[PDB]
Amino acid sequence: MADWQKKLTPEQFYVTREKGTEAPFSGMYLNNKETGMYHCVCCDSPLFSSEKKYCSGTGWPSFSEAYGSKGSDESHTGILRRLDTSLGCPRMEVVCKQCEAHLGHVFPDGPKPTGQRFCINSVALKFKPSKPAAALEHHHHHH
Numbered sequence: 535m536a537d538w539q540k541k542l543t544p545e546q547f548y549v550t551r552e553k554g555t556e557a558p559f560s561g562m563y564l565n566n567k568e569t570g571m572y573h574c575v576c577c578d579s580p581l582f583s584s585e586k587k588y589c590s591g592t593g594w595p596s597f598s599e600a601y602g603s604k605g606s607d608e609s610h611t612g613i614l615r616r617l618d619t620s621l622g623c624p625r626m627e628v629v630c631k632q633c634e635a636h637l638g639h640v641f642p643d644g645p646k647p648t649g650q651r652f653c654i655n656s657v658a659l660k661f662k663p664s665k666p667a668a669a670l671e672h673h674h675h676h677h
């Protein structure tokens with residue numbers, strides 16, 4: 535509103551359309567994509583490793599697990615969850631409670647739930663890479 539910028543490059547209105555599709559002329563998506571992780575820009579916490587990114591199929595924003603934490607960590611994470619099988623067919627969906635970010639979901643492909651695909655949408659999420667000269671996480675300094 536009151537603009538041309540946000541109309542030519544929408545954000546909250548764009549990612550909500552990308553919540554179902556791939557696109558050609560991918561540009562910045564036509565090169566390599568490194569290892570790393572993803573975190574909120576709404577709360578505090580890093581939550582998903584790019585290590586589980588569905589590469590060598592589509593490279594698209596999916597995560598073959600929500601990978602970094604286990605068992606003990608299901609209270610620590612500040613993430614929550616909600617299942618739905620009520621249309622006669624089972625779905626699984628997940629939220630961060632810290633940010634209230636309801637952005638991660640996992641759906642079957644037709645066979646057993648062993649074939650599932652876990653899609654996550656970046657509408658309030660940022661990322662940090664694995665490799666240095668863009669990773670620089672701890673201090674490097676002296677006396």
Ligand SMILES: [Zn+2]
Pocket residue numbers: 574577578579630631632633635
């Ligand atoms: Zn969060």
